[PDB]
Amino acid sequence: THRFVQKVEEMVQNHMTYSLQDVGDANWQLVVEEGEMKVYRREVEENGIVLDPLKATHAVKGVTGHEVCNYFWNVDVRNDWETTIENFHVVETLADNAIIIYQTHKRVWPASQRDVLYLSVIRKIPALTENDPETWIVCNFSVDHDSAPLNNRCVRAKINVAMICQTLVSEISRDNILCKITYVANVNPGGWAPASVLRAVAKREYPKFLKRFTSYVQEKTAGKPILF
């Protein structure tokens, strides 16, 4: 019971209430569709800066949500799949399922480099009823911290990202399992950046990040006991 338990609970529950809802919803603009993966955005600017909420859904054969979330959360494999960061440092271990991370992102010309400081928590949400599936969720959201590094080259972004996973099973085989992912990211670039750049990056890099990440999960897990 670290100092962030109540805030974690609130971020997680807002995701379970809002992020999981189907989008039908003309609010969401469907931007990219490649097979199982659908990527939506809303066009939002605050103080002239692009904030466009991003939401993707995906269906990945042969993995569970527990697996997907472990791989997304576990800093030990962070460097194998991650293509967006130059460095990260674990600032603080809060619990066996919660840490605070500092990371610097690769520069995207011509915007300044960004850094981010966030709490990352992995959580299992038991089936609400015996009909409903259980859910595994990772939430990454920005927090303040006294041991925040000094990085004069970087503008501080703020993020609220969730990777939310439900598992369908049709002796259980990988052939028989399907992980349904909803992934959401609300990123505040934290100072001026060209609108066109942020939008092209999002539109090109989110589908790649997600197909790449999930392909890595399928690969790391294939022919290994199923961790439900």
Ligand X SMILES: CC(C)(C)c1cc(-c2ccc(S(=O)(=O)CCO)cc2)cc([C@@H]2C[C@@H]2c2ccccn2)c1
Does 111 engage in binding with ligand X (CB under 6 A)? Answer: yes
Using CB under 6 A as the binding rule, whether residue 98 contacts ligand X is answered as no
Question: Which one, 87 or 176, has the nearer CB to ligand X?
Answer: 87
| 139: contact with ligand X by CB under 6 A | no
Task: For residues 140 and 161, give the distance between their C-alpha atoms in angstroms, rounded to a whole number.
Answer: 5
User: For 62-220, where are the E strands, in sequence order?
Assistant: 85-95, 98-105, 113-125, 135-142, 154-156, 158-169, 177-188
Number of residues that bind ligand X (CB under 6 A): 20
CB of 226 to ligand X, least distance (A): 24
- The bridge status of strand 154-156 relative to strand 177-188 is unpaired
Q: Which amino acid is residue 2, in one-letter code?
A: H
Buried b (16+ CB within 10 A) or exposed e, 39-63: bbbeeeeeeeebbbbbbbbbebebb
**Pattern of binders to ligand X over 155-174, x per CB under 6 A?**
--x-x-x-------------
105 scored as a contact of ligand X (CB under 6 A)? yes
Question: Do the annotations mark residue 118 as ligand-binding?
Answer: no
CB neighbour list of residue 173: distance below 8 Å, 6 or more residues apart: none
Region binding ligand X by CB under 6 A among candidate stretches 20-28, 31-39, 59-67, 105-113: 105-113
Decide: is 119 part of the binding site for ligand X (CB under 6 A).
no
Collapsing DSSP states into helix, strand and coil, what is residue 224?
Answer: coil
Annotated binding site: 82, 103, 140, 183
**Which residues would be at the binding site for ligand X (CB under 6 A)?**
54, 84-85, 105, 108, 111, 114, 140, 157, 159, 161, 185, 187, 189, 193, 198, 201-202, 205-206
